[model samples]
Target: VSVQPNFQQDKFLGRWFSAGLASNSSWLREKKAALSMCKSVVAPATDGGLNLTSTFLRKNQCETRTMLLQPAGSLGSYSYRSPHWGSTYSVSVVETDYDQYALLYSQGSKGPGEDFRMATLYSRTQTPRAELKEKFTAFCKAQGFTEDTIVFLPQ
Candidate 1:
C-alpha cells in the first residue's frame, strides 16, 4: 500500500469535508443517490487515536458522530474494531498534501461471507479540483470499484 510517505499526522489534522465516496457496500451503493456531502473534523486524542467527527444530514436533521481510530500497524495506518459492532476496519491515508485534498481508504470485515470496502476523498474547501476528483476515481478503481460506484457530492 502506497500510504503517504512518513504521513505527517500534525499536517493532516484540520477541518475537512467528504467530497466523494466510493464503496461496494449496498447501503452506500443505493443510499448515496440521496446523499449530500458530510463535514468532518480530524483531531488527535491524548492516546494518539485520531478522532474523526462527522456531521451529515439524516432525513431533515443533522446527525453527528465520532470514531476513534487508533494508531496501529504502521506510521500511516489506523483501525477501529469492537465486538459490540461486530466489525473491524482499517483506515489509511492513500495520499494528501495537507492543504488541498486527501484520499482515504476504509475496508472492514462485515462478516465471513460479506465484503465491505470504501474509498473517501476529503477536501479542505467546498470547492475541490477536477484533477483530484479524477485521482479519487483511479484510486477507487485500484480497490476494485467502477465509475458508477463513485459519487462526487453536490456542491
Candidate 2:
C-alpha cells in the first residue's frame, strides 16, 4: 500500500546527491548538458514520488513527475517532461552493510543495460570520512559497479 515498506518518513525526507551515469548514455550526456545549462536542481518530494524541475540553459526546460517508488522495496521510478523529450527512470537506494553510506541508482529509465544511469551516495554533510569512503567503495564494487563509475559531489 506504501511506496516503501521500510520507508522512514524522517530519514527519507531530506536532500540527496546525484552521481554519474547508470543508464541511457544519451540521457547522461544530456544530463551533463542540462547541468551545464541549468544550475541543477534536486528532485523535491511530492506525495507519491518526487517532482523534478529545471531549465536547460535558455534552450529548453523540464518538469518531471515520478511515481516509481516501490510498493515495499528500496526501488523507485520517475516520469519526467521536457521540451526535447520525456522519459521514465527506475531508481534504487543501495545501502551499505555498515550503514555508513547510501548509494542511489538510476537503473535505466525503462530497463537494464550497460547504458544504465549512475549511482550517487547522499550525505547530510559533505566530505564523508576516509573510512566511510572506503567502506562505500567496497559496497559499490560488491554491487558490480566500478569505483570510477561514481562521481562524488557536494549538495
Candidate 3:
C-alpha cells in the first residue's frame, strides 16, 4: 500500500471530521445520498497501535464505533479488523498535512465475491476546502475508483 513517507504518529493524533469517500461497495451505492458527516477521534494505543473512535449521526441519534489499527509493514500502514465480522483491511495514510486534511486508502475482502476498495478523506473542520475535495477526487481516480462512486459527505 502507498503510505506517507516519514509519517509522524504524534502529528496525526487528534479529532477529525469525515469529509469525503470514494468506494466501490454496494453499501455506498445505496447509502451515499443519505450519508451525513462523521467525527473521529484518533489516539495511540499502548501496544504501538492506533485507536480510532468514529461517531456518525443516523436515525436521529448518534452511532459510534471504535477500531484498533495495528501497525503493519510500515510506519503509515496499518491493519484493521472488523470486530465480530472476521473481516480485515489494510489502512494507510496516503497523504496528510496533519493540520488541514488527511487522505487514506483501504482495500479488503469480506468474503468470496465481496472485495472492496475505499478512499477516504478527513478534514480538521466541518467544511473542507474545495481544493482538498478536488485532490481527493483525483486521488480516488488514480486508485481506479469511478466518478459516480466518489462523494463528499454532507454536513
Candidate 4:
C-alpha cells in the first residue's frame, strides 16, 4: 500500500479521535457501540519509538489500551506489538494532513493462523469535514472496502 512520502511524526503527536473505521472482523462489528468516542494519544518514547494510549467507552465505562510503535524502514510505517493481545501489528499512514485528519491502515497476526486487517480515520476533533470523510471512504473503497462494511464512529 502507498504511504505518506514525508511523514512528520513530531507534528502527529497529540490526541486524535476516531471518526470512522473499516474492517472485516465480526468482533469489531459487534463491539461498535462500545468503540464510540474512541481517542488515541501519541507521545514520544525514550527508545525513539512512539507510545500510544487508546481509550474508549465500553458499557458506560472507560477502557484504555497502550502500545509502543517502533519506526519501520519506510516513512509512515511502524511496527507495534500489542502486550495484551500478543500480536505483531504494523501500521501505515495512508494519508494525513498533520492538523486536520489522518487515514491509517494496519494489519496484524496473532501467532499461528489468525490475521486481521483494519483501517481507521482519525480527526483532530470529534468530527471531520464532509469532504475528508468522502475522501477516506473513496480511498477505502478503492482498496477493496465496501460502504456497507465501513462503520462511522459515534461522537
Superposition-based RMSD of candidate 1 using all C-alpha atoms, in angstroms: 2.1
Tell me the spans in candidate 4 whose CA falls farther than 4 Å from its real position. 58-61, 109-114
What is the total number of backbone clashes in candidate 2?
11
lDDT values, one for every candidate:
0.84, 0.43, 0.88, 0.82
Top-down lDDT ranking:
3, 1, 4, 2
What is the lDDT for 104 in model 2? 58
In candidate 4 the C-alpha lDDT for residue 151 amounts to 81
Top TM-score model? 3
Ten-residue region with minimum lDDT total, candidate 4 = 108-117
Q: How much does candidate 3 score in TM-score? A: 0.92
Candidate 1's residue-wise lDDT over 36-124, tens digit each?
Answer: 88899999977787898999876699889888888876767888775665787878898999999899988774554136688999999
Per-residue accuracy of model 4 over 1-155 as CA lDDT, tens digit each: 78887888899899998898888787876776665658999998776768889997677898898888888778788888766676787889888999999999888855521477888898999978899889889877876777766888888
C-alpha TM-score for every candidate: 0.89, 0.52, 0.92, 0.87
Model 4: pairs clashing at backbone N, Cα or C within 3 Å: none
Question: Candidate 3: lDDT over CA atoms?
Answer: 0.88
**What's the true lDDT of residue 10 in model 3?**
93
Clashes of each: 0, 11, 0, 0
